[PDB]
Write an enzyme that holds these catalytic residues in place. Structure first.
Site, PDB file in Angstrom:
ATOM      1  N   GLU A   1      31.096  50.711  50.768  1.00  0.00           N
ATOM      2  CA  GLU A   1      32.279  50.414  49.989  1.00  0.00           C
ATOM      3  C   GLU A   1      33.382  51.408  50.385  1.00  0.00           C
ATOM      4  O   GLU A   1      34.558  51.030  50.510  1.00  0.00           O
ATOM      5  CB  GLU A   1      31.997  50.620  48.520  1.00  0.00           C
ATOM      6  CG  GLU A   1      31.126  49.478  47.965  1.00  0.00           C
ATOM      7  CD  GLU A   1      31.827  48.119  47.937  1.00  0.00           C
ATOM      8  OE1 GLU A   1      33.027  48.012  48.313  1.00  0.00           O
ATOM      9  OE2 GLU A   1      31.063  47.096  47.642  1.00  0.00           O
TER      10      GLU A   1
ATOM     11  N   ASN B   1      43.148  43.858  47.016  1.00  0.00           N
ATOM     12  CA  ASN B   1      42.408  42.576  47.124  1.00  0.00           C
ATOM     13  C   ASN B   1      43.388  41.450  47.179  1.00  0.00           C
ATOM     14  O   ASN B   1      44.531  41.576  46.724  1.00  0.00           O
ATOM     15  CB  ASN B   1      41.453  42.384  45.931  1.00  0.00           C
ATOM     16  CG  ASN B   1      40.390  43.471  45.794  1.00  0.00           C
ATOM     17  OD1 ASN B   1      40.146  44.024  44.713  1.00  0.00           O
ATOM     18  ND2 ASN B   1      39.771  43.817  46.882  1.00  0.00           N
TER      19      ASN B   1
ATOM     20  N   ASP C   1      43.681  38.823  45.465  1.00  0.00           N
ATOM     21  CA  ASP C   1      44.110  38.384  44.138  1.00  0.00           C
ATOM     22  C   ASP C   1      45.084  39.374  43.486  1.00  0.00           C
ATOM     23  O   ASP C   1      45.505  39.168  42.355  1.00  0.00           O
ATOM     24  CB  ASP C   1      42.894  38.104  43.219  1.00  0.00           C
ATOM     25  CG  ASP C   1      42.134  39.362  42.784  1.00  0.00           C
ATOM     26  OD1 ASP C   1      42.503  40.472  43.194  1.00  0.00           O
ATOM     27  OD2 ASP C   1      41.171  39.247  42.004  1.00  0.00           O
TER      28      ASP C   1
ATOM     29  N   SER D   1      44.414  42.486  42.664  1.00  0.00           N
ATOM     30  CA  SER D   1      43.725  43.580  42.075  1.00  0.00           C
ATOM     31  C   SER D   1      43.531  44.660  43.168  1.00  0.00           C
ATOM     32  O   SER D   1      43.753  44.396  44.339  1.00  0.00           O
ATOM     33  CB  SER D   1      42.368  43.140  41.479  1.00  0.00           C
ATOM     34  OG  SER D   1      41.495  42.732  42.550  1.00  0.00           O
TER      35      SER D   1
HETATM   36 RU   LIG Z   1      35.320  45.095  45.991  1.00  0.00          RU
END
Ligand SMILES: [Ru+3]
Ligand SMILES: [Cl-]
Ligand SMILES: [Cl-]
Ligand SMILES: [Cl-]
Ligand SMILES: [Cl-]
Ligand SMILES: [Cl-]
Ligand SMILES: [Cl-]
Ligand SMILES: [Cl-]
Ligand SMILES: [Cl-]
Ligand SMILES: [Cl-]
Ligand code: NA
Ligand SMILES: [Ru+3]
Ligand SMILES: [Ru+3]
Ligand SMILES: [Ru+3]
Ligand SMILES: [Ru+3]
Ligand SMILES: [Ru+3]
Length: 129
Positions: A35, A46, A48, A50
């Site tokens: 990550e 992201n 979207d 976010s």
């Molecule tokens: Ru993620």
């Protein structure tokens, strides 16, 4: 802060992740590797709108408040900036809530695609724990 592999393993264990909801410590270390490359300051926007924050790339659509994600929640009750700290407490506490949410670690797409089913104990091998 950029953790070393074993340093993060130890810290995660100190903070209660060693087999939390039945996920062994190497699962958590493997998730953090892919990550964030073990960097507490990692952020990534992201599609979207976010943003993902910290060592476990926790998202502002559901879990933290960053003040710029419309229609979002803050289920961990924390500013997303807390997730970027050298101290992993907020990230670990929020991760425990996420992994308890019904889909276990599949909530981290990088864990499903790069760690799940692999020899995750490799990630803690050699470490003084
Ligand atoms: Ru993620
Ligand atoms: Cl501590
Ligand atoms: Cl374990
Ligand atoms: Cl362990
Ligand atoms: Cl917001
Ligand atoms: Cl810590
Ligand atoms: Cl599970
Ligand atoms: Cl393991
Ligand atoms: Cl191994
Ligand atoms: Cl252990
Ligand atoms: Na939010
Ligand atoms: Ru949910
Ligand atoms: Ru829920
Ligand atoms: Ru092995
Ligand atoms: Ru120990
Ligand atoms: Ru021990």
């Amino acid at each position: 802060k950029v953790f070393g592999r074993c340093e993060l393993a130890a810290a995660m264990k100190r903070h209660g992740l060693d087999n939390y909801r039945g996920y062994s410590l190497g699962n958590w270390v493997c998730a953090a590797k892919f990550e964030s490359n073990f960097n507490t300051q990692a952020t990534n926007r992201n599609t979207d709108g976010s943003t993902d924050y910290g060592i476990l790339q926790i998202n502002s659509r559901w879990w933290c408040n960053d003040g710029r994600t419309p229609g979002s929640r803050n289920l961990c009750n924390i500013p997303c900036s807390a997730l970027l700290s050298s101290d992993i407490t907020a990230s670990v506490n929020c991760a425990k809530k996420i992994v308890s949410d019904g889909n276990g670690m599949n909530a981290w797409v990088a864990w499903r695609n790069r760690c799940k089913g692999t020899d995750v104990q490799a990630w803690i091998r050699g470490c003084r724990l």
